């Protein structure tokens, strides 16, 4: 898992970033401080990130092959 | 007064502009959405304009030489 682990954290880094970006453009909407059409692209990236992380997470997990049943 | 009148209106135009700029940046520095150094500059210009306008107004007014006393 050297890599899957790398990607998974490389991702989370990203999400943590875009997620802040979004949340900020949000509160800053009710001030024109952030247009409605921008808090769109920002929330766009945020959703993509959130998706990448879930995929990375999924792959990393498959890295540890588990046994489906109890037996021999 | 062709010119004094021109300058005065040339000024007022300016003030109306910078004034808006200021009033706006104010509510935007109140959201960290704008540098603190910037809003300062904006209110700087606004003040300069307001000053310019007053001087223009004064000069225009002197364009009409009135009589100080009643007499002959």
UniProtKB/Swiss-Prot annotation, chains A, B:
Phenotype of the disrupted gene, per the record: Disruption of MexA, MexB and OprM significantly reduces active efflux of N-(3-oxododecanoyl) homoserine lactone/3-oxo-C12-HSL/PAI-1, but not N-butyryl homoserine lactone/C4-HSL/PAI-2.
Note: In both X-ray crystal structures approximately the last 100 residues are not ordered.
Effect of residue 28 to D: Abolishes complex formation and thereby abolishes drug resistance
Subcellular location per the Swiss-Prot or TrEMBL entry: Cell inner membrane
Encoding gene, per UniProt annotation: mexA
Its job: The periplasmic linker component of the MexAB-OprM efflux system that confers multidrug resistance. Functions as the major efflux pump for n-hexane and p-xylene efflux. Has been shown in one study to be involved in the active efflux of the autoinducer N-(3-oxododecanoyl) homoserine lactone, thereby playing an indirect role in quorum-sensing; but has been shown in another study not to be involved in efflux of this autoinducer. Over-expression of the pump increases antibiotic and solvent efflux capacities. Implicated in the secretion of the siderophore pyoverdine.
Subunit text: Component of the MexAB-OprM multidrug efflux complex, composed of six MexA subunits forming a hexameric tube, binding to a MexB trimer, which interact with the trimeric OprM outer membrane channel protein. OprM is thought to not directly contact MexB; instead, MexA joins MexB and OprM by forming a funnel-like hexamer anchored to the inner membrane. MexA may initially form a hexameric ring complex with MexB prior to OprM, then OprM undergoes a conformational change as it contacts MexA, allowing the periplasmic gate to open.
Membrane-traversing stretches: none
Protein name: Multidrug resistance protein MexA
Membership in a protein family: Belongs to the membrane fusion protein (MFP) (TC 8.A.1) family.
Organism name: Pseudomonas aeruginosa (strain ATCC 15692 / DSM 22644 / CIP 104116 / JCM 14847 / LMG 12228 / 1C / PRS 101 / PAO1)
Induction: By growth under severe iron limitation.
Coiled-coil region list: 2-56
């Amino acid at each position: 898992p050297a890599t899957y682990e790398a990607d998974y954290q490389s991702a989370q880094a990203n999400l943590a970033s875009t997620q802040e970006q979004a949340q900020r453009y949000k509160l800053l909407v009710a001030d024109q401080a952030v247009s409605k059409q921008q808090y769109a692209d920002a929330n766009a990236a945020y959703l993509q990130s959130k998706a990448a992380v879930e995929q990375a997470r999924i792959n990393l997990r498959y890295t540890k092959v588990l046994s489906p049943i109890s037996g021999r």
